[PDB]
Structure 1
Amino acid sequence: MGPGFDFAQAIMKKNTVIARTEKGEFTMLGVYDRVAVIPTHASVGEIIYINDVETRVLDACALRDLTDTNLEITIVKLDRNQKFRDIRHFLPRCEDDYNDAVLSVHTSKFPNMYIPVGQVTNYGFLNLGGTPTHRILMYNFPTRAGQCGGVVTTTGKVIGIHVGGNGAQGFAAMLLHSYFTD
């Protein structure tokens, strides 16, 4: 509808796949080469389904900060025959607050879905389903199940992936440039 949804649409059309684990279907952001991200609570194993194709997982890493605290981001390398568009230059280098964010989801259940979530707070510490979690972004949208993995963008930046909510607010794990330095 406007330049926010334009940027979000550009990311969704080239840099997302539908990931299926034993914990369900997720939006999964491809970042560069065969490297993608997903909420750690997806519990990625040896094999994953990518757009309903059985795919071997070459590597999976559950990120923790240097305090040894959960970040809820799993970096996954896929045994796929095709590379993602490199979007590492759209990742912010620092933790920050942002205005006018969009949350974008694509699954079987929620295809071509885009939500204007508005202002995004650098929230920091969250007890997420009982797990101490750091580097959390918060937006005042009553987000629901099916939306985890969803991509949080501003015009020009990909800032995080949706990992939960409480019925009033939604929560995203920050993406930072430094996670994907090869």
Structure 2
Amino acid sequence: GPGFDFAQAIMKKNTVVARTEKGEFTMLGVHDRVAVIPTHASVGETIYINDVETKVLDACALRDLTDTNLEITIVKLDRNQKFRDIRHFLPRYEDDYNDAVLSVHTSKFPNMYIPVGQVTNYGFLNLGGTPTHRILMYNFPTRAGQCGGVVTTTGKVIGIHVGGNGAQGFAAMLLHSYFTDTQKHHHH
């Protein structure tokens, strides 16, 4: 019994449509003015958020300690509204999951929910020719237009959709420690 109600609460308060030179993506807002988007979106210095041109104050394309793409880009946005803080719904650790929902919020699909079933910690993925780590996999035929879609179970936001091979879909994990209010160094 997929957590449709939870998915819908997340979509309603915590997603916007983002558009870059690469097209539209569902965008999950995490806290304050911080959101995520797949790294293949190629975030620049500005982005459209619900068709409003918006200054990108920071964009961090995450990579692990092997210097490998994680496919998550964290963005800080110059806008007035704060996102509801949903960090407490992010998992602490890598995990497998049951009965997940993928939800999309784009111009073409402003509110759509797809039960993808079981989600497994998959690991390595050649993503459009880019070596990528920390991938989650579900046996569902996801399509173009669903990148950035949010993967939830009840009470957890576990990843965002980034790829698919026609039979399976792939999400980059979200972990709680990606967003903890932290320390000082030169990142660009």
Q: For 1:128 and 1:108, how far apart are their aligned partners in 2? A: 25
Matched, 1:141 2:127: no
How many angstroms does 1:3 deviate by? 6.1
State the number of aligned residues.
Answer: 181
**TM-score (normalised: structure 2):** 0.95
SS in 2 for 1:3: coil
Q: For 2:2 and 2:119, how far apart are their aligned partners in 1? A: 17
Matched, 1:17 2:16: yes
How many angstroms does 1:110 deviate by? 1.5
Where does 1:76-155 land on structure 2 (aligned, <5 Å)?
76-155=75-154
Q: Over residues 63-82 of structure 1, what are the superposed CA-to-partner deviations in whole Å (9 max), with x where a residue is unaligned?
A: 00111110000000000011
Q: Over residues 24-46 of structure 1, what are the superposed CA-to-partner deviations in whole Å (9 max), with x where a residue is unaligned?
A: 01000000000000000000000
Q: For 2:114 and 2:161, how far apart are their aligned partners in 1? A: 12
Verify the 8 A CA contact 2:2 2:99 in the aligned structure 1.
Answer: no
**TM-score (normalised: structure 1):** 0.98
SS in 2 for 1:8: helix
Verify the 8 A CA contact 2:2 2:115 in the aligned structure 1.
Answer: no
Verify the 8 A CA contact 2:142 2:164 in the aligned structure 1.
Answer: yes
Verify the 8 A CA contact 2:2 2:100 in the aligned structure 1.
Answer: no
Q: For 1:3 and 1:94, how far apart are their aligned partners in 2? A: 21
How many angstroms does 1:157 deviate by? 0.2
How many angstroms does 1:59 deviate by? 0.4
Q: For 1:157 and 1:137, how far apart are their aligned partners in 2? A: 14
Q: Over residues 115-173 of structure 1, what are the superposed CA-to-partner deviations in whole Å (9 max), with x where a residue is unaligned?
A: 00000010001111111100000000100010000000000100000001000000000
Q: For 2:125 and 2:58, how far apart are their aligned partners in 1? A: 27
In structure 1, list runs of 5 or more residues that go unmatched.
Answer: none
Verify the 8 A CA contact 2:137 2:168 in the aligned structure 1.
Answer: yes
Q: Over residues 45-101 of structure 1, what are the superposed CA-to-partner deviations in whole Å (9 max), with x where a residue is unaligned?
A: 001000000100000000001111100000000000110000000000100000010
Q: For 2:65 and 2:2, how far apart are their aligned partners in 1? A: 36
Structure 1 residue runs of 4 or more that deviate by more than 4 Å after TM superposition: none
